Amino acid sequence: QVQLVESGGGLVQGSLRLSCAASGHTFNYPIMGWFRQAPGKEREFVGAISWSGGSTSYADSVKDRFTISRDNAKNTVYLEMNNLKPEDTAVYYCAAKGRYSGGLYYPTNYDYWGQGTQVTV
Amino acid sequence: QVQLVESGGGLVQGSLRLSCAASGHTFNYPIMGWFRQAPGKEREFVGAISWSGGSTSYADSVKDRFTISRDNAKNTVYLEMNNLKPEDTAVYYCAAKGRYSGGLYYPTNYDYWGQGTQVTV
Amino acid sequence: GNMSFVKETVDKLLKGYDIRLRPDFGGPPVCVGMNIDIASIDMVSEVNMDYTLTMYFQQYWRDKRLAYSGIPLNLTLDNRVADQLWVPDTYFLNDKKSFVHGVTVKNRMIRLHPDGTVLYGLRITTTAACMMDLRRYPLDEQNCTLEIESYGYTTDDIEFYWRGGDKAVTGVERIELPQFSIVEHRLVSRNVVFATGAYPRLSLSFRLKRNIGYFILQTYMPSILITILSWVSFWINYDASAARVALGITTVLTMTTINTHLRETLPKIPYVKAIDMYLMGCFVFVFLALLEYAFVNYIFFAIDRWSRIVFPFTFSLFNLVYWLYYV
Amino acid sequence: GNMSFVKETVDKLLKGYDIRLRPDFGGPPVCVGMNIDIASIDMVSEVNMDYTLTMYFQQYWRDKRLAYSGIPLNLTLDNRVADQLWVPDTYFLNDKKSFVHGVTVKNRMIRLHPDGTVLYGLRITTTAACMMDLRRYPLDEQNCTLEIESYGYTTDDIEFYWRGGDKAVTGVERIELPQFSIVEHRLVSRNVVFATGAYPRLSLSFRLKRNIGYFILQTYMPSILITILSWVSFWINYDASAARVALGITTVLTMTTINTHLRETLPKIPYVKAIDMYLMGCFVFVFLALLEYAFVNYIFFAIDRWSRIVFPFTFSLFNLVYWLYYV
Amino acid sequence: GNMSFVKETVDKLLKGYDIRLRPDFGGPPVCVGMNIDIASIDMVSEVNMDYTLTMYFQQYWRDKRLAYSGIPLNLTLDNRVADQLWVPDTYFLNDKKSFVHGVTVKNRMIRLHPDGTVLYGLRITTTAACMMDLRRYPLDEQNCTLEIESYGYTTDDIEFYWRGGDKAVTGVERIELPQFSIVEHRLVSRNVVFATGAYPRLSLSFRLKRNIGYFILQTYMPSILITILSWVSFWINYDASAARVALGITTVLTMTTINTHLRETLPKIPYVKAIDMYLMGCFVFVFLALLEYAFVNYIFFAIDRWSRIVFPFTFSLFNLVYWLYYV
Amino acid sequence: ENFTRILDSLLDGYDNRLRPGFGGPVTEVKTDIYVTSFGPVSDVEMEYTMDVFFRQTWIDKRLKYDGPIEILRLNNMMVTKVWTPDTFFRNGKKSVSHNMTAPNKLFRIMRNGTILYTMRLTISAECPMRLVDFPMDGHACPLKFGSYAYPKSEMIYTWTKGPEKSVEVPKESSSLVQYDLIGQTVSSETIKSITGEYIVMTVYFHLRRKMGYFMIQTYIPCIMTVILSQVSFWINKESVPARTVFGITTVLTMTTLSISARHSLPKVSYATAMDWFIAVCFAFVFSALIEFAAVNYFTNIQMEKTSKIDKYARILFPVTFGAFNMVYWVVYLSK
Amino acid sequence: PNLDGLIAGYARNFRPGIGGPPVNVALALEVASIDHISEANMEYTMTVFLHQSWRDSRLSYNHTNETLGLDSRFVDKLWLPDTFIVNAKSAWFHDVTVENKLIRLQPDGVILYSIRITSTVACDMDLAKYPMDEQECMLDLESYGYSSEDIVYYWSESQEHIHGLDKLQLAQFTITSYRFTTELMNFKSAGQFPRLSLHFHLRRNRGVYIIQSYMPSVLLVAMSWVSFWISQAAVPARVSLGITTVLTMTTLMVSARSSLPRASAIKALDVYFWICYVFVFAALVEYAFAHFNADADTIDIYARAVFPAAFAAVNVIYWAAYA
Ligand SMILES: *[C@@H]1O[C@H](CO)[C@@H](O[C@@H]2O[C@H](CO)[C@@H](O[C@@H]3O[C@H](CO[C@H]4O[C@H](CO)[C@@H](O)[C@H](O)[C@@H]4O)[C@@H](O)[C@H](O[C@H]4O[C@H](CO)[C@@H](O)[C@H](O)[C@@H]4O)[C@@H]3O)[C@H](O)[C@H]2NC(C)=O)[C@H](O)[C@H]1NC(C)=O
Ligand SMILES: *[C@@H]1O[C@H](CO)[C@@H](O[C@@H]2O[C@H](CO)[C@@H](O[C@@H]3O[C@H](CO[C@H]4O[C@H](CO)[C@@H](O)[C@H](O)[C@@H]4O)[C@@H](O)[C@H](O[C@H]4O[C@H](CO)[C@@H](O)[C@H](O)[C@@H]4O)[C@@H]3O)[C@H](O)[C@H]2NC(C)=O)[C@H](O)[C@H]1NC(C)=O
Ligand SMILES: *[C@@H]1O[C@H](CO)[C@@H](O)[C@H](O)[C@H]1NC(C)=O
Ligand SMILES: *[C@@H]1O[C@H](CO)[C@@H](O)[C@H](O)[C@H]1NC(C)=O
Ligand SMILES: *[C@@H]1O[C@H](CO)[C@@H](O)[C@H](O)[C@H]1NC(C)=O
């Protein structure tokens, strides 16, 4: 039982910092993922971070552009969207993955989905 | 990431002491090898020493002539070239071998090559 | 859909198949692609200098003897078919003890493709050697590798590559070691030469950073508290010989028990670790505090006031130098 | 009754049977029903973060190749027939070490039904991983799962379900762990996606609640008694320097031995547990009691009366806050 | 290149091949050459008097039954062919427990040569006995051997030699034991006679030199510090009976705990080691220091000044004699 | 196929499921044992380990062959194709047959039909022990083996050599640490069961424990602790805190030594010889503190209207403890 | 000859009379030894000669009237009951030098099948009265796959004679009684399975082992009584004696349950330590009460009699409760 609230999207022309605040049984769900769904297109993997250790992975599109990290004090994950592009125009969602729930990349493996900030540039 | 600087070559007619000073991640590279490349000929094994233990091995040509040893304080290996011969005329190189990098004798197993002192007699 | 048709096709594939001969025997080497999906790192042992890894190990290669036509599917076959096929002779050069899981069946997969590509998967638990440099322990960073090699086939016969390059290894985020964080992993490919020839090698390594927190609590904090305890003596009257000598003894002896206990948890290395240096410093402080009283006792039959300031000040300096050097 | 007739029927079933091909190969997935009868949970290890389970594991599916007519019985066959049949490639994804019991024979059952339903039973002991959150230890609640999956067949080929829904798992009442009570068990079904495709998953989880009683007796009570012992000092005359300093030392040092011993029974976690917080509180009380005497000693060459009330009162407050927060 | 041609050739080689009969059965002995590539020495146990070795073990011999023509290659064959060939019945006479690594396949190689030379390689981990002389422990030098012999074939039938003479064993530089340095290795060949006949033997031995450093830190230094601590008594006033008696007791009892602990790490040998001699000397010093006070106490109801010089001087002499005898 | 024909002829019409001379004369199997290494003896587990070359020799007329060579030294896996005795170790709780680089089996077929079949085994056999005299005790660990299935009417076991030369235990083979193998004796016995009556061959190994380790690990610290307690007698009675600490620490030390002595020793109902020594030494240590308590109690009465008790204790205690040592050692070392 | 003929056409996958009445299997046990009885693991290791007897008409031979003594090679050819130990944590066969199996094929078709097996059997132990406690352990035998309609077990008549439990000598326990029980009402999910169980009662030996367990605790109580005769003027003497008896008792309590890491139940040994701890702690409080009021000699005089009497009284109650 995890609740995710994300904020800091909005519209810009640029550096941005999406944030994702978790609460509840985060121990059972050690991984947080960032997805993004463009209108029409399928929901697409952006990156993921382990709560413990900060082991990070990125999709190629955003490799060496976006940076994820977290702070366990607040139970917060942030996607620092630097060097934005008009391809980066989607509803960005946050999600939690169970320990044994499969590959990072696949949104169907994830159980607890944030609301989803729309971001247009 | 290992750096090797060798010195004490030169030209003589005799006892000589080549030295080989290592710096960096020497833990991952426990073995130092001495090679020599005559003009035209292939690069040829001379001997090798373990940093820890001083387990030593020599090529037949230099067996009971050359002697290798080291001092871990300075991170230095030395080839004491006694009883020299006109066959012993080559660019002597120093090199480091990884723990699991194969046989002592084969220069392709070695990763970090010193500059190479030319020695003629 | 027609199972007799599929059975016929597969029977034909295996008719006259010689498991003894690699694909393209006598020709160019067979290229074998590798992918690892890490399940867990169960244990890291300083005393045994090894770690235990569980992974899904997959091998990809083409065997033109197994090519089939007229079926637009990939055939997933029962794992027992693996005993009738050639497979690579892959081994882990730095492994100590390994097994393929066997419940409820051998954790093994075979998937054939129409072009003769064979996908062979195994679920393996391996205990693998990892020589550790404990000079900075417990403020140390270790490099633990897994070395993957062909046992008997040289690079004339077989070649390895990381299938997918830097994405060939998945599941590094799953590793949950309380005492370590995985800083980085790297994938390497090279050829290794032995007396019997040149062999293909793949290497997977991890950088492990020890978490200090446990050690602060388990060893560092008790030693600090014993050292502070030793200073109480300086506020006690010099006539209280039993009280002040008791403080000296108990702190000195407690520091010995802490030292000896600690090194029984670790391998019998001949060099001094970082933690040894700290404990030796703390021992010297508490020993000098007792010797200070011996000196006071020696002349009374001033020094305490000078001790009340110089000892805490020196211990603060000692800690400052130590933690700067090592952190 | 006619054994030659039954032998003929069974021989016919297995004539030309291809173990390599799943039932309905190339068609809709085979539905495999699973039910577990728990025999025991032998051990739960915090240090290894795992538990050991013994169960009767049964698999239900239909193989139309094995359908037989003219015999109105279910045929129980010798377990060695299992080697001539297709069986699912079921494995336990979070298992560390498992085996099928082998005395006096392999603990395995095969029961055939006239419609071709196969009942396949195994008696398995598994050691399975269970990552534990020890922040509240020993007042903690843990979730330990068993993850059941098809190794090589995707959901195109095989599907799992809990046969009987919420009654598919029996024997939870048999579990007798001294240190834990089973609060609840749950059954889950889902699909898990990997690079090689989507796989069927069944998950069995338990909620374990640690029994406090052992810990009250083993660690909490000794620490309380040492803290009370420390207060005896305040009723001793301030001239009794040896006596009062002895009380301070012995209680302080006893609290260190208790702390260090405790954490040697547990994994090397970097965070502070509930029990650590208690022991640290108790340490501070007994340390301040000795420092109180140093202060008295310091000025005499009142405070004790104030100590006789404030210390027991503060310790009661400390305990109240602690046990309210965690219970 | 033609795999059907190679398959035909190899099939012909194995047609009518009798694994029961050694090459040249009934004729001169088959000469078997042996080379070892050492991978690791994982452990050396004084308690169990054994060591654990990992090596690549290779056997070279000629089997004229396997000679083939018209292929100018050496054939590397799948390791499963080994089950269809004669191989030597080599065993390790002083091994306690050994296994061939089995992941991902049996770590085994077979390479055939046109003249019928067979190259057979195995990767073996062996725990082998090594009787140790601990009279000088921990300043001792040990000789640990590996004895290689033919189990059932006498020297009438099989002969062993080190292939390459003094270069037959590689990888001695890889051995990384924290507690030991490898001083030397030697290769020996001889015949050993039993009631059943004369058998070929090869022996590989190593000379191990224990590193003192760990022992200086773990046992020697604490004992020195306790002995020095005992001398503090002589600077304390003779009226301080509690203080001086406390020093005597604590040092004496600490030296007993150190002694008994140490010998629990070692086998139950009936003789006195070097370290035992040191600890017994240190015990005598600290015991006499307490007895010195008993004597002072006895007459007071001088000696201390004489003790302040004679005790440190005697301990220095004791150490000088000890470390000269043993180093 | 000069020898392949011979082997095929021998195996042709041969049933390995029937003993030689089935239904007729009793099959005699000659057994001899060569102990390669007598492993450590675990007192706590009452078991010992041993590696042997278990040789078996019998006659099978079905394998008679005529040829040039007299002895056919065949491969180790020829064994599975021929009948072999089913010998098992009755007291062997765990045993391993080595398989390194080959199954460690020897198989030779002589011309007249005699078969020499040997195997290399690591045997862990149960050894009941009586630790009443521990550590000054000795044990005779047996090794019983015999046919599991064939009764004495179908197969019997005889020592190949004489009852003295059949078992060979070289001195170098002794891997014992705290024991010494004085000698070995063999015997043959017959047991009866519901399955049948079987011949059992027993080998007894006489082990004498070495008390050098226990002398210094336990006895010396215990003796010195008692001597340490007696030092408090010479201390003046006015030093009440000093003599009080003497008694307390010595009592605590004896408690630690008593627990450590029984740590490795298995838990038994009866009292070992070392248990008596510790108990008596504990009494002397405890009585030393009681003596000081009596001294302090009496001197307070004298103070409230240089001690006789101390003078008596300085002499009586060393003599009584010394007398106990002479009695204790003579009684047990004589056995 | 005819041995090959019996195997020829023999159906291994089917029990004798697959469609008929269930097969009666006589069961006998010869307990060779019982060892490694651990309370912490709640398990014991047992080695037995398990005998099974049943009739198979397919193997009936009439050429001779002599029983056929066969080795373990012939075992794989015949159908065997799937008897397994229900409460066995782990088990294995002895295969040195060969597999310890025998087959006795009588002419009428009766088969005798005996195997030497060593099994580690789980046994739940109640440590309420530890160490003065008696434990009952069981050995359950059952058919894994064949219900009551296929295989029915019963103890053979010879079981009463060759059980061998009397000859067993255990290091710490004594087999007071044994009982062979048959349960036909197991009723598992698959069906009804007859179960044969062997119950034996183990009594822990009372001797030096128990004396050593209580020896330090009793002595420490006597150590605290020494301070009563010590004068109240020597404050460091009595305080040091009081604290050491309390601290050492605390260490004993920690060490007592260290040997049983997971024994969360209450043991009689643990109760005795608390009783000892109360007396040693009260003695230190007794001096503290006397010392505080001396800023009385009668307090020590009462303590020299009340404490020895009170400790004697509670011991009588303690030992009477645990008999
Ligand atoms: C733990 O410690 C191990 C060593 O014990 C480290 O492993 C080393 O990793 C480095 C990379 O980080 C390796 O360096 C690379 O080696 C590659 C292989 O080269 C060999 O093979 C080729 C043919 O395939 C030969 O031509 C060549 O001579 C060698 O024999 C190179 O291909 C790499 O070159 C690439 O990068 C370099 C810069 O690094 C560029 O200059 C090149 O142009 C090219 O892009 C590279 O040199 C090294 O070989 C590894 N050593 C061993 C023994 O395997 C682990 O990285 C370490 N783990 C952690 C986490 O730190
Ligand atoms: C220990 O911790 C584990 C997690 O690590 C817990 O496991 C979770 O258990 C909960 C139930 O308690 C699971 O939630 C359920 O998941 C089911 C599966 O849904 C997936 O698959 C379907 C297709 O089959 C997809 O459509 C879906 O998107 C998912 O991918 C759902 O079917 C369940 O829905 C039902 O219940 C909910 C309310 O809970 C209703 O709203 C629905 O209408 C429906 O009735 C449910 O959502 C969860 O998936 C489990 N997680 C994992 C990782 O397995 C253990 O429960 C816990 N143990 C204890 C004792 O607490
Ligand atoms: C049993 O079945 C066989 C095979 O069909 C048949 O030949 C035989 O007559 C049958 N016997 C009986 C009694 O039905
Ligand atoms: C390969 O060898 C086979 C068998 O000798 C032969 O029939 C075939 O023609 C050969 N093919 C080639 C290309 O040489
Ligand atoms: C057959 O088994 C039943 C049930 O155990 C038993 O009552 C009956 O006596 C047995 N028959 C024989 C002949 O032993």
Side-chain angles (χ1 to χ4, degrees), chain D residues 2-6 8:
Chain D
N2 187 351
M3 280 180 77
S4 71
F5 176 58
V6 175
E8 273 190 350

Side-chain angles (χ1 to χ4, degrees), chain D residues 3 10 44 76 78 80 101-104 107 111 122-123 174 176 178-179 217-218 225 237 250 254, chain G residues 12-15 17 58 76 78 83 85-86 88-89 93 124 144-146 247 254 257 262 274 277 291:
Chain D
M3 280 180 77
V10 176
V44 176
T76 304
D78 178 22
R80 284 168 285 184
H101 292 252
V103 172
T104 63
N107 288 196
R111 188 174 303 166
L122 296 167
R123 185 167 74 117
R174 294 201 181 92
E176 288 193 2
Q179 161 168 222
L217 296 162
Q218 185 61 25
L225 295 170
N237 196 335
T250 60
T254 302
Chain G
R12 187 186 67 176
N13 297 330
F14 313 95
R15 63 175 184 88
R58 294 174 294 180
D76 195 16
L78 309 184
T83 301
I85 307 178
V86 181
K89 292 189 175 181
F93 296 87
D124 190 8
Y144 188 84
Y146 296 96
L247 304 152
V254 177
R257 307 187 192 90
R262 286 188 140 270
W274 306 337
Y277 189 90
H291 178 69

